[PDB]
Symmetry: C3
Subunit: 555 residues, 3 copies
């Protein structure tokens, strides 16, 4: 009698402590499943949840190298608090100092080696490129390691993993749809990506998100996607996420062919997220391979339809922050893209590397990047793009000859910052829509409005409008000067108004007999010097266009 009442009035949950294997618990579960004791799993251990909609509450660890594979969870299933930990304590490198300066010297990086499940990462082949010479210097026991404790959700729909954490930990959603990794509680990564949505088989992934939370370390990228397409609804991607110290990149959409098909991604959101101190890049949102690319795209659009780097990727990209990359802050490719509100600070390589065409970039800030001169420039754009608002330069100087922006096919407006103008290369730069203007000068005895024709010279101003103090401060007097370059000497030739408060115009004249072709316009005169009589002459182009030579000033 009581049993009838009790079966109706109490919440169903079983606990793993009461079962000899995880499958035994899974098979018996109805609603709740509590992980209340640490569970040692073998790599490839596979649990069949019978299509049941389960709420898996974790208050202990899953311990093992390799993958713990969950299958046949019903839509609406949730896994909370999971903690993955490897059995192996690998050798890790820590390529930064106790003052958070990046180490770049291979020998210094090797000297950091320790056995730990955190506070660094296992070297991989990409480290051989990142730290040149390290391949030879690393001891064999620190090369080729492959330690990750991975929770794999396999071929499920509508499963969410919440508040996950771990040590040498990874989370893989393989062949899943409408799944989410929510509020990741700072798992410390292993050899593989920390959060992966991989859909190389089956239908293109859709509805797969990283929402909130953060990760640390890992040998490769923190959050990554293969063969996902969010549809026009943009149903997938990364929102509200933080990546710290990825061994590769913070957020990565894969490029090129993986196995026999495309790993590329379309129609995802990348918004409201932060990547700090990646060893490679902050955001890597390209789809085509840059160096030595495939000649085809099996499973994707052919090269005949869209050239390399010109896929209609159509991601929704907004409100991203990157700081401290040892590689590139923000990288992408594609055609027809809109990108907005990107802030990149203090990166050793380019702040932005944009292999894009017919794309628009709005309100971009690239602040103290390429600080180790790893790339040619701070921001590169290959194709014919538009940039509307670009902040350049924080507090760092540049000693060498590298460009700040090289966007040779792009049209740009709204640069702010103490950029060295010789380090700008664009197709067209303009402020078409300014109002009435004032140039305010501080810390000088003059104010200047300068002109520079980059075709003539990228390094020398070709003319200027100046105002210069006469006397000293408080004099109530200045002179205005209109200048032109000659013989590569800026300001060589000039007209002045009010020099020494004289209230007159000082007019330059041709220092010898003027040639006919020196005068440009009709109804104008050009003064010139006749030294043989101590006279000024005037070459006059009359209103009718004919030339005459007159005497202008005499002894």
């Amino acid at each position: 009698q009581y049993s009838i009442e009790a079966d109706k009035k109490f919440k169903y949950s079983l606990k793993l402590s009461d079962y000899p294997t995880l499958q035994d618990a899974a098979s018996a579960a109805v609603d709740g499943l509590l992980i209340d004791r640490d569970y040692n799993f073998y790599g490839g251990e596979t649990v069949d949840f019978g299509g049941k909609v389960l709420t898996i509450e974790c208050k202990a660890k899953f311990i093992g190298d390799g993958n713990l594979i969950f299958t046949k969870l019903g839509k609406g299933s949730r896994i909370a608090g999971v903690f993955m930990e490897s059995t192996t304590t690998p050798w890790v490198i820590k390529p930064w100092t106790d003052d958070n300066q990046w180490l770049t010297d291979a020998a210094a990086v090797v000297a950091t080696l320790k056995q730990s499940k955190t506070d660094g990462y296992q070297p991989t082949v990409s480290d051989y490129v990142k730290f040149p010479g390290i391949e030879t210097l690393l001891p064999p026991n620190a090369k080729g390691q492959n330690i990750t404790s991975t929770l794999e959700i396999r071929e499920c729909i509508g499963v969410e993993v919440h508040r996950a954490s771990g040590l040498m930990a990874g989370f893989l959603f393989r062949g899943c749809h409408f799944c989410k990794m929510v509020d990741a509680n700072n798992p410390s990564g292993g050899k593989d990506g920390i959060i992966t949505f991989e859909n190389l088989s089956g239908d293109w992934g859709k509805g797969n998100y990283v929402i909130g939370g953060r990760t640390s370390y890992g040998s490769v990228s923190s959050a990554q996607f293969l063969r996902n397409n969010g549809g026009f609804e943009r149903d997938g991607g990364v929102i509200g996420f933080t990546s710290y110290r990825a061994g590769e990149s913070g957020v990565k959409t894969w490029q090129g062919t993986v196995g026999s098909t495309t790993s590329r991604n379309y129609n995802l959101q990348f918004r409201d997220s932060v990547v700090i101190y990646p060893v490679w890049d902050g955001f890597d949102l390209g789809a085509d391979t840059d160096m030595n690319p495939e000649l085809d795209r099996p499973g994707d659009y052919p090269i005949t339809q869209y050239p390399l780097h010109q896929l209609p990727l159509n991601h929704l990209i907004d409100n991203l922050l990157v700081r401290g990359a040892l590689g590139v802050g923000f990288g992408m490719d594609g055609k027809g893209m809109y990108v907005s509100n990107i802030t990149v600070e203090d990166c050793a390589g380019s702040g932005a590397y944009l292999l894009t065409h017919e794309s628009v970039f709005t309100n971009i800030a690239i602040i103290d990047t390429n600080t180790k001169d790893f790339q040619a420039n701070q921001i590169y754009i290959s194709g014919a793009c538009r940039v509307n608002g670009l902040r350049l330069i924080g507090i760092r100087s540049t000693d060498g000859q590298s460009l700040t922006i090289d966007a040779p096919n792009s049209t740009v407006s709204g640069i702010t910052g103490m950029v060295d103008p010789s380090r700008i290369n664009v197709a067209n730069l303009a402020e078409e829509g300014l109002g009435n203007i004032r140039a305010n000068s501080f810390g000088y005895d003059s104010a200047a409005i300068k002109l520079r024709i980059h075709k003539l010279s990228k390094t020398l101003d070709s003319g200027a409008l100046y105002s210069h103090i006469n006397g000293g401060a408080g004099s109530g007097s200045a002179y205005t000067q209109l200048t032109a370059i000659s013989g590569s000497t800026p300001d060589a030739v000039s007209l002045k108004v009010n020099h020494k408060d004289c209230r007159g115009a000082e007019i330059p004249f041709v220092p010898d007999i003027a040639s006919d072709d020196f005068i440009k316009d009709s109804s104008c005169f050009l003064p010139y010097w006749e030294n043989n009589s101590t006279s000024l002459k005037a070459l006059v182009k009359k209103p009718n266009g004919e030339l005459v030579r007159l005497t202008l000033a005499t002894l």
Copy 2:
């Protein structure tokens, strides 16, 4: 004995499968209530939860056309995972192509008709305006449909609905306070608004939020408010939300009278949210009716106190993104408003439609909008407002004569982008606080600093300061030119410095006898031509202000 122990140590939850009706389960529930089987409800089915603080966990569907009404939930009650689904599969339209281009032709829209619970929406009367002629062309079976499966929370305080989803689904909070719709899991909408806080009766709504999540489709607006006032504490609104493909608008505060009282809203937050591909508008934050307005405001401030469009709405509006609207990206009205950090891209109608007065807009970006020329301009502001930072123009051209910004009573500073200056209309445009300036020119043999007096001509520059190459690249030589318009020919009259590297000033003279009134200032001279003697003359205004005519240059 065991029963005493068990009653104390187990969590209380009952499951709907054990009860014949939802009311029977509600009446028996203590703490938890599990929806473990699909439940078919009749429209208007009303459940009385006895004031109990319940945690309702949904792992199955509520199925029915019409409203499932929950009442008398205690403060702190939570409903998670709810899934609403209609019994009717209606006719829906899908006014976009397989390349995500909007369809605007009525006949093309009619051709998209299919029976589905998603992937489109049921036509409503607003479609008759949006797609002109469609009212005549739609078959009768596709007109006037009214399918929604709505969870209605009625007259409750402190109830939260989390992770809701569905098909033809809606969520209505009627007469509620301190309620939230949290992390909406992409419900696909029906005929009515997807998320509604309606407080037409009782106290003004307060504490009501949409937090996080997203919605898709629906015939009308995704998230909407009637008669809510967040108080000075700004306790309500929309934060962190995404709307896709609203049949009307993404986020809407209602305007005008509904029933017998005001539907307007005050003191709400609209922040950190995204609206993509609405059929009408991204954000519709107006309170007064634009076309054919009421002559009064029953239940609100009278017109005598605040004129139409001048209510002190006082919303907190920041960090919003809109892309792809078929209507207006961002619309509002009100007086005394501050708005910041708004980004609008790729809209067919105006990017921003601002019926505002004595309001401030900071860091606005309106990028490639009014692309179908549906409105007069890309950004319109009616009243006397201030705009501080305005990015205009992405990559699209404008073939016709429409203005980009028409803000005739507004003062604006900080435009960036390749705007056509003839398409700017403002009360005042200025950059008062620039430093020393350099104009850098790429892709031309000259650099230019131009002036345009819009009262004189909106299409022609009235004067310029140029620098032009002498010779070719690398010559180290340029000439500076100061010009003025005459006879509507820009640059008609000019003074040059260093033309052809001559190191002299070429000075324009009056091509005939100068009239007395041609000279402006004392202690100045004006050269002019005397053709009858092949002489230059000078009209001199002496230091004492009197005129004299002198001979300046002779044969």
Copy 3:
């Protein structure tokens, strides 16, 4: 037999109603603990949770003045829905009007006194400074009150408090690590800080966050940190948070010595958050004491290593909004800082007060601040910093002489807004990287490009390039004018091109005999007046640099 089955298949939870004290329930709990009845606690009541990982679900109140202390919760424990309420109803002040105008007059503030647990705050000693004279005017029963109902989590790791609320409520994490205050459900504060992470004893705090949610009222700061260091991983801080009407500041990192050691903080995130209507400041992110500072830093870096205000605080600060402060919107100190995307509106004191050195500020907007002239300026920067993008001025005027920006050691670029240029003081202001420029003028018969040398005069332009209409609108004619200041009269001396459509240049001449030193450059001439013969003369500096005087124009 049934008991064996039941013990395995039901979720364990006990409820406080079944136990005489909270400790009795804690001791018996296994998994869940339900707070189902209001519980009156005594101040200092301490509960030992036995290291157990518990899920504490609150559906009733903890009632008491003083602290309810939770200890020995296991990592992964969660407390949801907690509601703290005092037993005392104190006297509170409400220093704002029914139109949300701040009250500043002490007598007016005293007149607001009422007994309530909300809608105002208990006066503290800081109010004596904020409202001068109020110390004398407050009745003794409204002074020195100390009412807070505080949930204290003591020396725990990995505990999260979710959806907390209350009246006169506070939340203290003392000596905790890896703890979070998540989705605070608008608790109304008491005398102490609403959310505090205090780590004065033990290891520096790390992993401690406020994530999401909001608070209202309180006598002091809403969210605050003492002796936390997030490490290079930036593992702690405030993300996604809203503070309303703090009695002191919205978000505060403490400064100086507290007790015997440092209260300072390093390496925290402050992002994506909003502070509205604080009585003092929006964000107070300083570490050193401004007024009457300590001569040392026990427990921290010594002054010999880092001077006052020059600590390497290294916080990650981005995407913050402040509106309506009665004090300062955004304040900080430190050296080597990067700060981005800060928006401050409508503050009575300075929008930003930056005691920083060698720091970079990118995309800052300070809009209508120092509105009550409480400080010297709207934005102050003490040290040698860089500002890249600064929006100034909304719609408010300034009647007095206060500066807008005073950043005397800083280099700034990219100011936008209707700033009064006389109210800018910086070390250097420049736009180095503009393209070809157009100045568009509306509402005037002229367009202007002005120059101002602040060393000469902060209030008068020293020269200008103008374009002015000849005739009226549509004439197709303008004149260009190049001017210079003399005798503190702007535009006193000028050269014109095309005045009255004459097609000639009007040239100013020296109104008397020119002195030798009036001419600057070789191969130039300077016209001057010889009144005794009604002649223009020319002072000529020949190509060889020697002077000669010629006759230029004669009767």
